[PDB]
């Protein structure tokens, strides 16, 4: 049993996002809460709305939440929840999680079951794809059998990027920061990742679902 | 329904060594309180409901009491991988008019490993960057044990703006960081002084890495 969240992104504020949940691997045959718990950058979880799955439909908001959010079971297998009104308090990673209902006092009661999460940013900026710069060690330095290179992936809106290294062939050895947010609201992050120095190049391949861009940079030994 | 207060705020314990938190309700709220582990970039994972029941899977040196008001997690041979934040819940539902869901507002949970230095790394800005107006220097101090602080000096001047840090979790091993500094400045600044500094402090301890973008 799992769950897997969806239609997360940018919106301006004001805006209006509706985000459903998909429910895979469960058991009909019993009654579940489905619910919506929230995440703002560096902060605590914050429960949003619960909806039980039996045939009442009954849900359970969070004061703050009545009005602006709706959850409902649209389906066997997805839970929805709406939210308007939108200001850049509401940017958060939004988490479906499932618990048990109390039955006989039997259960599992508490979310036993989370999604990965799916990240909302509520800004004015347009989308904004990174520039990507390579990072060598300086031109002075005595070589060695190995070197750490790497990319800074600047000035994109909103997250996430992924960055790879020669496409997943460099695995071990990657160190990929998490991003700052700069006042002006973009991010930026650097990687770097460290190898045996050989004729093979070294890529980084940086891509921003966003903007659907891809951009590889090829990192020069600086040499 | 009832707020949670967890406290301490922030905990560090010795690899192997033993943790408890706390978690207190503004009412009473019987034994309808869980626990759940967060590490930085994962989804929460549930440890305890019922107030000590343990999850499925969950190791018994994690274990949960109470019940009313005050709670209590306590993790004992606390491992490098135990490093996270930690939240209790009140889950239950009396009636439409009487549920509850709310959390705690966490505890961060740091596992101390035995102190070790930074190695350090310095990136001067491609020549690409300096095109664009704007350059970033990089600064990389990796594994790590316990918090730096970092300076930057550009020609022996101390910088006091343009600095960005961004620090990794602690490693699942041995509980060291990473972290990478990086100070921006215009082309001009840049392409006007010689020696790029960056130091990496931990207490009387300091590692620092330069280069001269002359030769470069």
């Known amino acids: 049993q799992s769950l897997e969240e969806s239609g997360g992104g940018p919106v301006k504020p004001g805006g209006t996002l509706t985000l459903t949940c998909k429910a895979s691997?469960?058991?009909?045959?019993?009654?579940?809460?489905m619910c919506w718990v929230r995440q703002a950058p560096g902060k605590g979880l914050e429960w949003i709305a619960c909806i039980v799955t039996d045939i009442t439909g009954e849900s359970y908001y969070a004061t703050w939440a009545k009005g602006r959010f709706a959850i409902s079971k649209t389906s066997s297998t997805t839970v929805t929840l709406q939210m308007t009104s939108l200001t850049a308090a509401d940017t958060a990673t939004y988490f479906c999680a499932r618990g048990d209902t109390y039955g006989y006092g039997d259960t599992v009661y508490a979310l036993n079951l989370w999604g990965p999460g799916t990240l909302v940013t509520v800004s004015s900026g347009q989308p904004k794809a990174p520039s990507v710069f390579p990072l060598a060690p300086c031109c002075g330095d005595t070589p060695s059998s190995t070197v750490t290179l790497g990319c800074l992936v600047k000035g994109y809106l909103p997250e996430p990027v992924t960055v790879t290294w020669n496409s997943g062939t460099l695995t071990n050895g990657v160190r990929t920061f998490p991003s700052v947010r700069q006042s002006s609201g973009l991010y930026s992050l650097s990687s770097v990742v460290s190898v045996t120095s050989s004729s093979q190049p070294v890529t980084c391949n940086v891509a921003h679902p966003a903007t659907n861009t891809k951009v590889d940079k090829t990192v020069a030994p600086s040499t | 329904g009832p707020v949670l207060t967890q406290t301490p705020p922030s905990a560090s314990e010795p690899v192997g060594g033993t943790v408890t938190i706390k978690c207190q309700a503004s009412?009473?709220?019987?034994?309808?309180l869980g626990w759940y582990q967060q590490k930085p970039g994962q989804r929460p994972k549930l440890l305890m409901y019922?107030?000590?029941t343990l999850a499925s899977g969950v190791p018994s040196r994690f274990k949960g009491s109470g019940s009313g008001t005050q709670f209590t997690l306590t993790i004992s041979d606390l491992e490098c991988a135990d490093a996270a934040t930690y939240y209790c819940?009140?889950?239950?539902?009396?009636?439409?008019?009487?549920?509850?869901?709310?959390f705690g507002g966490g505890t961060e949970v740091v596992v101390k490993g035995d102190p070790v230095a930074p190695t350090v790394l310095i990136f001067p800005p491609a020549a690409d960057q300096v095109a664009t107006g704007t350059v970033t220097i990089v600064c990389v101090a990796n594994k790590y044990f316990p918090d730096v602080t970092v300076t930057w000096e550009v020609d022996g001047t101390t910088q006091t703006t343009g600095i960005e840090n961004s620090k990794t979790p602690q490693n699942s091993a041995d509980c060291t960081y990473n972290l990478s500094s990086t100070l921006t400045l215009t082309s001009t600044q840049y392409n006007s002084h010689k020696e790029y500094t960056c130091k990496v402090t931990q207490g009387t301890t300091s590692v620092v890495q330069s280069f001269n973008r002359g030769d470069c």
């Open positions: 691997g469960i058991d009909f045959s019993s009654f579940y809460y």
């Open positions: 009412q009473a709220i019987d034994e309808y």
């Open positions: 019922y107030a000590s």
């Open positions: 819940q009140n889950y239950y539902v009396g009636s439409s008019t009487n549920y509850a869901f709310t």
